[PDB]
Design an enzyme around this catalytic site. Structure first.
Site, PDB file in Angstrom:
ATOM      1  N   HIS A  44     -11.879  40.179  64.263  1.00 42.06           N
ATOM      2  CA  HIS A  44     -11.336  39.185  65.177  1.00 42.06           C
ATOM      3  C   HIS A  44     -10.836  39.853  66.470  1.00 42.06           C
ATOM      4  O   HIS A  44     -10.429  39.171  67.414  1.00 42.06           O
ATOM      5  CB  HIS A  44     -10.219  38.338  64.518  1.00 42.06           C
ATOM      6  CG  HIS A  44      -8.883  39.018  64.452  1.00 42.06           C
ATOM      7  ND1 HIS A  44      -8.369  39.539  63.284  1.00 42.06           N
ATOM      8  CD2 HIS A  44      -7.957  39.258  65.411  1.00 42.06           C
ATOM      9  CE1 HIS A  44      -7.185  40.069  63.524  1.00 42.06           C
ATOM     10  NE2 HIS A  44      -6.908  39.913  64.807  1.00 42.06           N
ATOM     11  N   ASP A  88     -13.172  39.973  57.824  1.00 39.22           N
ATOM     12  CA  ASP A  88     -12.557  40.422  59.063  1.00 39.22           C
ATOM     13  C   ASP A  88     -12.575  41.953  59.136  1.00 39.22           C
ATOM     14  O   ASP A  88     -11.573  42.625  58.879  1.00 39.22           O
ATOM     15  CB  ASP A  88     -11.122  39.882  59.129  1.00 39.22           C
ATOM     16  CG  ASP A  88     -10.530  39.966  60.525  1.00 39.22           C
ATOM     17  OD1 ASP A  88     -11.277  40.311  61.455  1.00 39.22           O
ATOM     18  OD2 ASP A  88      -9.321  39.682  60.687  1.00 39.22           O
ATOM     19  N   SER A 181      -2.979  43.967  64.068  1.00 37.75           N
ATOM     20  CA  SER A 181      -4.323  43.620  63.586  1.00 37.75           C
ATOM     21  C   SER A 181      -5.262  44.804  63.755  1.00 37.75           C
ATOM     22  O   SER A 181      -5.258  45.463  64.798  1.00 37.75           O
ATOM     23  CB  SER A 181      -4.880  42.432  64.379  1.00 37.75           C
ATOM     24  OG  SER A 181      -4.040  41.294  64.264  1.00 37.75           O
TER      25      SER A 181
HETATM   26  C1  LIG Z   1      -0.152  32.945  66.041  1.00 32.58           C
HETATM   27  N1  LIG Z   1      -0.589  34.118  65.199  1.00 32.58           N
HETATM   28  C2  LIG Z   1       0.126  35.374  65.265  1.00 32.58           C
HETATM   29  O1  LIG Z   1       1.117  35.593  65.984  1.00 32.58           O
HETATM   30  C3  LIG Z   1      -0.340  36.583  64.380  1.00 32.58           C
HETATM   31  C4  LIG Z   1       0.474  36.696  63.133  1.00 32.58           C
HETATM   32  C5  LIG Z   1       0.201  37.745  62.153  1.00 32.58           C
HETATM   33  C6  LIG Z   1       0.979  37.885  60.897  1.00 32.58           C
HETATM   34  C7  LIG Z   1       0.626  38.969  59.984  1.00 32.58           C
HETATM   35  C8  LIG Z   1      -0.470  39.929  60.246  1.00 32.58           C
HETATM   36  C9  LIG Z   1      -1.256  39.826  61.462  1.00 32.58           C
HETATM   37  C10 LIG Z   1      -0.988  38.760  62.472  1.00 32.58           C
HETATM   38  C11 LIG Z   1      -1.779  38.660  63.683  1.00 32.58           C
HETATM   39  C12 LIG Z   1      -1.475  37.579  64.647  1.00 32.58           C
HETATM   40  C13 LIG Z   1      -2.317  37.425  65.941  1.00 32.58           C
HETATM   41  O2  LIG Z   1      -1.841  36.828  66.868  1.00 32.58           O
HETATM   42  C14 LIG Z   1      -3.724  38.020  65.980  1.00 32.58           C
HETATM   43  C15 LIG Z   1      -4.695  36.942  66.565  1.00 32.58           C
HETATM   44  C16 LIG Z   1      -4.911  36.266  67.881  1.00 32.58           C
HETATM   45  C17 LIG Z   1      -5.982  35.236  68.134  1.00 32.58           C
HETATM   46  C18 LIG Z   1      -6.893  34.831  67.102  1.00 32.58           C
HETATM   47  C19 LIG Z   1      -6.834  35.383  65.746  1.00 32.58           C
HETATM   48  C20 LIG Z   1      -7.814  34.924  64.706  1.00 32.58           C
HETATM   49  C21 LIG Z   1      -7.779  35.453  63.349  1.00 32.58           C
HETATM   50  C22 LIG Z   1      -6.750  36.480  62.947  1.00 32.58           C
HETATM   51  C23 LIG Z   1      -5.754  36.975  63.938  1.00 32.58           C
HETATM   52  C24 LIG Z   1      -5.684  36.518  65.361  1.00 32.58           C
HETATM   53  P1  LIG Z   1      -3.691  39.446  66.998  1.00 32.58           P
HETATM   54  O3  LIG Z   1      -2.745  40.439  66.330  1.00 32.58           O
HETATM   55  O4  LIG Z   1      -5.074  40.005  67.018  1.00 32.58           O
HETATM   56  O5  LIG Z   1      -3.119  39.352  68.470  1.00 32.58           O
HETATM   57  C25 LIG Z   1      -1.807  34.109  64.183  1.00 32.58           C
HETATM   58  C26 LIG Z   1      -1.511  33.535  62.765  1.00 32.58           C
HETATM   59  C27 LIG Z   1      -2.797  33.633  61.901  1.00 32.58           C
HETATM   60  N2  LIG Z   1      -3.855  32.753  62.599  1.00 32.58           N
HETATM   61  C28 LIG Z   1      -4.397  31.594  61.982  1.00 32.58           C
HETATM   62  O6  LIG Z   1      -5.341  31.002  62.556  1.00 32.58           O
HETATM   63  C29 LIG Z   1      -3.896  31.021  60.601  1.00 32.58           C
HETATM   64  C30 LIG Z   1      -4.908  30.720  59.536  1.00 32.58           C
HETATM   65  C31 LIG Z   1      -4.522  30.186  58.227  1.00 32.58           C
HETATM   66  C32 LIG Z   1      -3.110  29.938  57.934  1.00 32.58           C
HETATM   67  C33 LIG Z   1      -2.667  29.421  56.648  1.00 32.58           C
HETATM   68  C34 LIG Z   1      -1.230  29.198  56.405  1.00 32.58           C
HETATM   69  C35 LIG Z   1      -0.211  29.479  57.435  1.00 32.58           C
HETATM   70  C36 LIG Z   1      -0.603  30.004  58.742  1.00 32.58           C
HETATM   71  C37 LIG Z   1      -2.020  30.246  59.033  1.00 32.58           C
HETATM   72  C38 LIG Z   1      -2.444  30.762  60.299  1.00 32.58           C
HETATM   73  C39 LIG Z   1      -4.286  33.282  63.970  1.00 32.58           C
HETATM   74  C40 LIG Z   1      -3.016  33.357  64.912  1.00 32.58           C
END
Ligand SMILES: CN(C(=O)c1cc2ccccc2cc1C(=O)[C@@H](c1cccc2ccccc12)P(=O)(O)O)C1CCN(C(=O)c2ccc3ccccc3c2)CC1
Length: 224
Positions: A44, A88, A181
């Site tokens: 991602h 991923d 990430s």
């Molecule tokens: C706002 N968030 C966060 O602040 C975030 C929290 C985290 C918590 C633990 C571990 C890693 C994490 C990484 C991130 C991100 O923002 C990633 C990032 C940016 C854009 C698209 C991405 C697509 C896939 C994976 C990482 C991604 P980034 O680190 O690459 O910038 C992230 C939370 C997880 N996401 C979800 O859709 C998602 C999916 C299923 C879920 C089921 C239950 C609860 C929450 C859920 C959230 C994406 C944005």
């Protein structure tokens, strides 16, 4: 990294800092060197332009120990699904081989299909956020306990225990977070996982990609 400590400088020489999309501050991710010409990270984090920094502690300073290399190829796993966040994992072939030394060297990977018992203590490192409001310029790390798969199977929709790892005791404010990430989860000093995702609050359990389920693909892709 939430609830962690600053890492002893250069104690994790395989750590890689990724800047995705030329524009400075357009996107940040972690990763780790698996060979002098390859860095493993999360799919991602893919971008058409990826600048890699190895041998760093403070990624906001042009340190003498750093080696700057661009990703010649950013190979996303063929079945990576950005919607469900499955598979991923991504391999970055570096434009040039790093000069291996005390500050820049590969990390050991798990053997094919190696699992992880719940309760095992592992360490994740990265330059990610320490809270919603604060980030870090220097490498930090925290110890987390592997969780029973049932927890992530309940919380996260597409979870697959073979290809992913459930990590982090909900009872502690410790976890990999935004910006971490792509970074590694070291269990017994071997890189079993890749930080993938979790709740936006950063409260664990969180999901890591299980490196041991992708060895064939990693092997093939690197056997170029
Ligand atoms: C706002 N968030 C966060 O602040 C975030 C929290 C985290 C918590 C633990 C571990 C890693 C994490 C990484 C991130 C991100 O923002 C990633 C990032 C940016 C854009 C698209 C991405 C697509 C896939 C994976 C990482 C991604 P980034 O680190 O690459 O910038 C992230 C939370 C997880 N996401 C979800 O859709 C998602 C999916 C299923 C879920 C089921 C239950 C609860 C929450 C859920 C959230 C994406 C944005």
């Amino acid at each position: 990294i939430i609830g962690g400590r600053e890492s002893r400088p250069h104690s994790r020489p395989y750590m890689a800092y990724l800047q995705i999309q030329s524009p400075a501050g357009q996107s940040r991710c972690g990763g780790f060197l698996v060979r002098e010409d390859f860095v493993l990270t999360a799919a991602h984090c893919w971008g058409s332009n990826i600048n890699v920094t190895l041998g760093a502690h403070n990624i906001q300073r042009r340190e003498n120990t750093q080696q700057h290399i661009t990703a010649r190829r950013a190979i996303r796993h063929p079945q990576y699904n950005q919607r469900t966040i499955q598979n991923d994992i991504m391999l970055l072939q570096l434009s040039r081989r790093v000069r291996r030394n005390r500050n820049v060297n590969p990390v050991a990977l798990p053997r094919a299909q190696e699992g992880l018992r719940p309760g095992t203590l592992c360490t994740v490192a990265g330059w990610g956020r320490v809270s919603m409001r604060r980030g870090t310029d220097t490498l930090r790390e925290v110890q987390l306990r592997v969780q029973r798969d049932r927890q992530c199977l309940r919380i996260f929709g597409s979870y697959d225990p073979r290809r992913q790892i459930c990590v982090g005791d909900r009872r502690e404010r410790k976890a990999a977070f935004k910006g971490d990430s792509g970074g590694p989860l070291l269990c017994n000093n071997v890189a079993h996982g890749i930080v993938s995702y979790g709740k936006s609050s950063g409260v664990p359990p969180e999901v890591f990609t299980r490196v041991s389920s992708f060895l064939p693909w990693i092997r093939t892709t690197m056997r170029s």
